[PDB]
Symmetry: C3
Subunit: 114 residues, 3 copies
């Protein structure tokens, strides 16, 4: 899986250990081994949410499987929780796009997962 977060929160406000915590917490939520999980945080962004420049985030979670109605509700609770706790972003100023990737459409180690 791959999780990306883009935010107008400044880099100095991202705590030590944030990437590692996102890895572990996504491993816990998805059940996927942590070795397969990639995470990416992009602070200091020029962004707005509902016309406002208060802290917000736009995020993506891609996974081969483990995406669906109930799963996505659980990941949203988990990930909004972590953004609120660690980056002080209100959950109502977060969007997370979920992508259920076909294995044939994910490349790794010179091939794909098909």
């Amino acid at each position: 899986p791959m999780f990306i977060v883009n935010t107008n929160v400044p880099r100095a406000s991202v705590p030590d250990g944030f990437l590692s915590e996102l890895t572990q917490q996504l491993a816990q939520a998805t059940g996927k081994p942590p070795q397969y999980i990639a995470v990416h945080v992009v602070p200091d962004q020029l962004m707005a949410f509902g016309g406002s420049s208060e802290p917000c985030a736009l995020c993506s979670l891609h996974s081969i499987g483990k995406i669906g109605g109930a799963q996505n509700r659980s990941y949203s609770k988990l990930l909004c929780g972590l953004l609120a706790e660690r980056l002080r972003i209100s959950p109502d100023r977060v969007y997370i796009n979920y992508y259920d990737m076909n294995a044939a459409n994910v490349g790794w180690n010179n091939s794909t997962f098909a």
Copy 2:
């Protein structure tokens, strides 16, 4: 809806008011309240369009509905017009990927829209 633009145009060439203008114009174009609209602009990128470093943009628009043939034509005219007017990017050096998002695949406020 959420609109992202990535560009090699430098940050100092992004005029004041641009995020708010994108928000307003996208709200009107999609027929949705501006509270739903998120915008994100990423200048100073290392990018080429047709092998040229001439100003260019790579963009995304994600929406739960209001995405489709005619609608996307209209959005392209609107958004290329803005990028041309504000960032001086030629419309033929802009790509915009449109995504019609399922409500279950968009997280917000500790849950999804499903």
Copy 3:
């Protein structure tokens, strides 16, 4: 087509020539003129792969068609090869997500490709 690479490799490690090299190599691989090929390299990113921050890359390739099982395996060997050779990223620390875009969902030149 568009190819984006996000990486923790520093900016000074990206060869001069790299964006042009990707443009040419992807034009050849997709069978489309280089005028249609957009490339975007984002270095110095805060990211982790498998919980470690050894050089890695998270990438996307979008195309209107020319996406599928064997074609994606081919792209993956090509792009991992370039990333290993030019940026010194191990292939088993690269993800590439592939997107087969509908023409109506790609904006360009004030309209779409439909």
